[PDB]
Write an enzyme that holds these catalytic residues in place. Structure first.
Site, mmCIF file in Angstrom:
data_model
loop_
_atom_site.group_PDB
_atom_site.id
_atom_site.type_symbol
_atom_site.label_atom_id
_atom_site.label_comp_id
_atom_site.label_asym_id
_atom_site.label_seq_id
_atom_site.Cartn_x
_atom_site.Cartn_y
_atom_site.Cartn_z
ATOM 1 N N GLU A 58 0.867 -1.190 0.000
ATOM 2 C CA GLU A 58 0.000 0.000 0.000
ATOM 3 C C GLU A 58 0.889 1.220 0.000
ATOM 4 O OE1 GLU A 58 -2.157 1.847 -0.714
ATOM 5 O OE2 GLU A 58 -3.780 0.788 0.309
ATOM 6 N N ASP A 61 -1.980 -4.948 0.787
ATOM 7 C CA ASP A 61 -1.331 -3.887 1.449
ATOM 8 C C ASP A 61 0.068 -4.251 1.863
ATOM 9 O OD1 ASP A 61 -3.587 -2.189 1.359
ATOM 10 O OD2 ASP A 61 -4.499 -3.430 2.957
ATOM 11 N N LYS A 113 -15.053 -8.156 2.201
ATOM 12 C CA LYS A 113 -13.696 -8.329 1.701
ATOM 13 C C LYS A 113 -13.407 -9.806 1.488
ATOM 14 C CE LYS A 113 -10.578 -4.414 1.806
ATOM 15 N NZ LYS A 113 -10.690 -3.625 0.528
HETATM 16 O O1 LIG Z 1 -9.835 -0.652 1.463
HETATM 17 C C1 LIG Z 1 -8.655 -1.016 1.693
HETATM 18 O O2 LIG Z 1 -8.313 -1.512 2.797
HETATM 19 C C2 LIG Z 1 -7.655 -0.846 0.646
HETATM 20 O O3 LIG Z 1 -6.406 -1.311 0.873
HETATM 21 C C3 LIG Z 1 -8.035 -0.253 -0.523
HETATM 22 C C4 LIG Z 1 -7.022 -0.030 -1.580
HETATM 23 O O4 LIG Z 1 -5.928 -0.539 -1.411
HETATM 24 C C5 LIG Z 1 -7.212 0.861 -2.802
HETATM 25 C C6 LIG Z 1 -6.778 2.311 -2.491
HETATM 26 C C7 LIG Z 1 -7.474 2.841 -1.274
HETATM 27 C C8 LIG Z 1 -6.867 2.656 -0.035
HETATM 28 C C9 LIG Z 1 -7.483 3.104 1.115
HETATM 29 C C10 LIG Z 1 -8.727 3.725 1.002
HETATM 30 CL CL1 LIG Z 1 -9.531 4.281 2.495
HETATM 31 C C11 LIG Z 1 -9.358 3.914 -0.233
HETATM 32 C C12 LIG Z 1 -8.713 3.460 -1.383
HETATM 33 C C13 LIG Z 1 -8.701 0.897 -3.228
HETATM 34 C C14 LIG Z 1 -9.184 -0.290 -4.071
HETATM 35 C C15 LIG Z 1 -8.102 -0.930 -4.929
HETATM 36 N N1 LIG Z 1 -7.019 0.052 -5.161
HETATM 37 C C16 LIG Z 1 -6.090 -0.408 -6.252
HETATM 38 C C17 LIG Z 1 -5.592 0.812 -6.982
HETATM 39 C C18 LIG Z 1 -4.358 1.367 -6.638
HETATM 40 C C19 LIG Z 1 -3.935 2.519 -7.274
HETATM 41 C C20 LIG Z 1 -4.749 3.105 -8.242
HETATM 42 C C21 LIG Z 1 -5.987 2.551 -8.587
HETATM 43 C C22 LIG Z 1 -6.410 1.391 -7.945
HETATM 44 C C23 LIG Z 1 -6.290 0.292 -3.906
HETATM 45 MN MN LIG Z 2 -6.369 -2.271 2.821
HETATM 46 MN MN LIG Z 3 -4.544 -1.375 -0.353
#
Ligand SMILES: O=C(O)/C(O)=C/C(=O)[C@]1(Cc2ccc(Cl)cc2)CCCN(Cc2ccccc2)C1
Ligand SMILES: [Mn+2]
Ligand SMILES: [Mn+2]
Length: 187
Positions: A77, A105, A131
């Site tokens: 992440e 992550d 999830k």
């Molecule tokens: O909800 C989580 O615990 C989580 O880890 C979510 C994600 O990692 C993504 C990014 C994100 C992280 C955290 C939040 Cl609160 C919102 C969005 C959102 C969904 C997928 N995305 C992949 C991505 C990365 C970079 C650009 C576009 C998409 C990555």
């Molecule tokens: Mn996450």
């Molecule tokens: Mn993530």
């Protein structure tokens, strides 16, 4: 929106905040507009880096908890998406672990597995279920001090966990004090 943006800057390390802003630009979002998504993204990143603090690997590959050393977790992440997959592919290429379908992550170099870290303003089973219904280990934390993990395997020790549960609980109080929490929760 100003009050939350101010809160965020005061509440998180500037490094976390610099990463959150880049993260939002990648997502096409503006941190001054979507201030709640901005707090959420800072919180999540913080929990990821906290999860990794103090954890290392020694010369025989034994894991070690320690108040220069090989980190036990790769932090996935925070990096941009193409960079993120590059690292993931290479771990799989170095270790035979199968590629996940979604970006996680973290990667655990001791347990050899990817971890998805969730942080929810909701209740945790509901989140776990969304999830989970989607070999990547899952670990969920709440703002109200609960947690849950795939197979009841929480990976870290208890102190490291209480540390994160405490931080999340504090973030909540501080928001609620600044009457920012209802809006954060309702979104
Ligand atoms: O909800 C989580 O615990 C989580 O880890 C979510 C994600 O990692 C993504 C990014 C994100 C992280 C955290 C939040 Cl609160 C919102 C969005 C959102 C969904 C997928 N995305 C992949 C991505 C990365 C970079 C650009 C576009 C998409 C990555
Ligand atoms: Mn996450
Ligand atoms: Mn993530």
């Amino acid at each position: 929106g100003m009050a939350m943006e101010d809160f965020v800057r005061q509440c998180f390390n500037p490094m976390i905040v610099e990463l959150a802003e880049k993260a939002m630009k990648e997502y096409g979002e503006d941190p001054k507009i979507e201030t709640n998504k901005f707090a959420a993204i800072c919180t999540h990143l913080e929990v990821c880096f906290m999860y990794s603090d103090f954890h290392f690997i020694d010369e025989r590959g034994e894991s070690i908890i320690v108040e220069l050393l090989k980190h036990r977790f790769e932090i996935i992440e925070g990096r941009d998406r193409i960079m993120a997959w590059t690292v993931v592919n290479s771990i799989c290429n170095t270790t035979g672990v199968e590629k996940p379908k979604f970006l996680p992550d973290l990667y655990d170099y001791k347990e050899n597995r990817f971890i998805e870290i969730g942080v929810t303003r909701r209740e945790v089973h509901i989140y776990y279920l969304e999830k989970a219904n989607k070999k990547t280990h899952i670990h969920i934390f709440s703002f109200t001090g609960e947690e849950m993990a795939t197979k009841a395997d929480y990976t870290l020790d208890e102190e490291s966990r209480a540390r994160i549960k405490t931080r999340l609980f504090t973030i909540r109080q501080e928001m609620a004090s600044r009457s920012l929490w209802d809006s954060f929760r309702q979104s």
